Design a protein around this ligand. Structure first.
Ligand code: AMP
Ligand code: AMP
Ligand code: AMP
Ligand code: AMP
Ligand code: MG
Ligand code: MG
Ligand code: MG
Ligand code: MG
Lengths: 261, 261
């Protein structure tokens, strides 16, 4: 079935072992850095939400272990705060930072750049809708992170996971534009499982997308776990998947044929 | 050999038929638009250089033919000028536009946005090198094009081809961040062949990268055509290819193993 094919493509499992998955992600990050020794930093945008809090903790753990094992003091995890003006859940971001205990935290306000981009487009004749402005913000955040990685010999860590990949619920070349994604394979509730195992404060992942999707995260997680969900729900999820295949593949060329089916 | 594997992966051929390749690219663009009818525009940044001039002409031809065939007057090709302040070869851009005869030309000056992004980074403690600033400009151009595509129901056309893909000579999520690439498979001199067949003014592609690469475009084209080049030259090209595999694949996950070889 299509459900079977999607589960296989995203690497999702019905149940996972929290600590075992924590080690799988940490060891992954450590192995990559030992294979490419010129990389001295891991860069990640912290939003105060579940996914970035989890990824952030895993990144710091990876660097902490590599330092002790190799003695290389130049390695570091750089957490990046990218507020648009004044961010609402700022206190949550502070709590997330306290939990992660990052080596370094840089704060870059993207408002000025976004307004400038919009002014240039307006003068040319293009006014943006709120939806498009949202993607523009996601792309400015990508830009900031890559400029930081470029000056610190680092790579940009992404928070993409199975529950977001299946619906293509990310901005193309926005938060989707990253170098390495240690959470890929996990669904939403499983991410909470890892945070619980890390003793993360409950309020940082205890409830917050479901509006635009037409399905809840529980529907998506159940689907990814191979469960039997209402047919109408399955069709909605599958429609999103097929519609967004372009977001999970490199630019289309004359050799591609996936879009012909 | 590695040369054989690379040629296969990029789809390059020793010799091509100019008109036949022109039709292959145009028919490709037309087929995609007929498969996804919600797409009403093709968006492409025009720089006055060889690659964008070629891609631009092919895009306009595709739209011209689709309009006559379907009668749909809402379809259009949008050429986008994205100068950083005052562009040097501006006259060449004007000549390129005269050759392409685009339905619409929008001019968006990216200088304001780039300076704003740099100011935000500077205040946080990050000063950019000229190289990194260059990538930042490429990413702001990507941002502008996607905002335009978002408001015009369009897709972003890329100019990536075999001679650039082999060395990864493009900005990750910059000019490399596109939706559909009609030139993919062609080497540099072959691109000139297509322009000659289209009667493009010679000065628009007659000579202009080779500095940073350590090899000339003729070395790269010869390599892609399966020719026997000096071993030192082959090793340099192959080094670039292996080093930039991350640019030609989606973000790295725990399931990938290409980087382990
Ligand atoms: N306010 C923010 N500050 C820093 N990073 C952000 C911000 N908002 C989004 N991000 C990053 O974008 C990722 C994707 O967010 P989301 O769009 O909610 O899936 C998060 O995991 C963060 O890494
Ligand atoms: N079917 C498609 N094939 C290739 N690119 C597309 C397609 N549908 C949408 N896009 C591109 O993806 C963008 C929407 O992605 P996002 O900005 O992430 O919401 C549109 O502005 C187009 O540039
Ligand atoms: N000045 C510019 N104006 C508009 N598009 C640009 C500009 N410079 C670069 N581009 C776009 O980026 C692509 C890649 O350029 P290149 O970095 O020279 O390989 C070109 O084919 C254009 O589509
Ligand atoms: N070996 C690698 N694996 C994954 N990402 C990398 C690697 N080498 C470089 N990068 C990323 O790609 C960027 C360089 O690409 P560019 O900006 O196109 O010159 C660096 O700033 C890193 O974010
Ligand atoms: Mg969020
Ligand atoms: Mg998220
Ligand atoms: Mg150029
Ligand atoms: Mg080019």
């Amino acid at each position: 079935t299509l459900q079977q094919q999607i589960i296989k493509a995203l690497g999702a499992k019905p149940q996972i072992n929290a600590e075992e998955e924590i080690r799988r992600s940490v060891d992954f990050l450590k192995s990559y850095l030992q294979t490419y020794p010129f990389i001295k930093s891991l860069v990640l945008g912290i939003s105060g939400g579940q996914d970035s809090t989890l990824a952030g903790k895993l990144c710091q753990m990876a660097i902490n272990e590599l330092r002790l094992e190799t003695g290389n003091e130049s390695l570091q995890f750089i957490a990046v705060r990218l507020p648009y003006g004044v961010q609402a859940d700022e206190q949550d971001c502070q709590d997330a930072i306290a939990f992660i205990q990052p080596d370094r935290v840089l704060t870059v306000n993207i408002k000025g750049a976004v307004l400038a981009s919009e002014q240039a487009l307006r003068e040319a004749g293009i006014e943006l809708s709120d939806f498009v402005r949202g993607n523009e913000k996601a792309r400015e955040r990508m830009k900031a992170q890559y400029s930081i990685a470029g000056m610190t010999s680092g790579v940009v860590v992404g928070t993409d996971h199975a529950a977001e990949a299946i619906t293509g619920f990310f901005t193309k070349y926005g938060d989707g534009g990253t170098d390495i994604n240690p959470l890929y394979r996990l669904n939403k509730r499983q991410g909470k499982q890892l945070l619980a195992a890390l003793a993360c404060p409950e309020h940082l992942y205890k409830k917050a997308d479901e509006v635009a999707l037409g399905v809840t995260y529980d529907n998506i997680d159940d689907y990814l776990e191979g469960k039997n969900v209402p047919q109408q729900v399955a069709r909605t999820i599958e429609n999103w998947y097929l519609k967004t295949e372009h977001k999970r593949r490199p630019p289309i060329t004359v050799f591609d044929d996936f879009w012909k089916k």
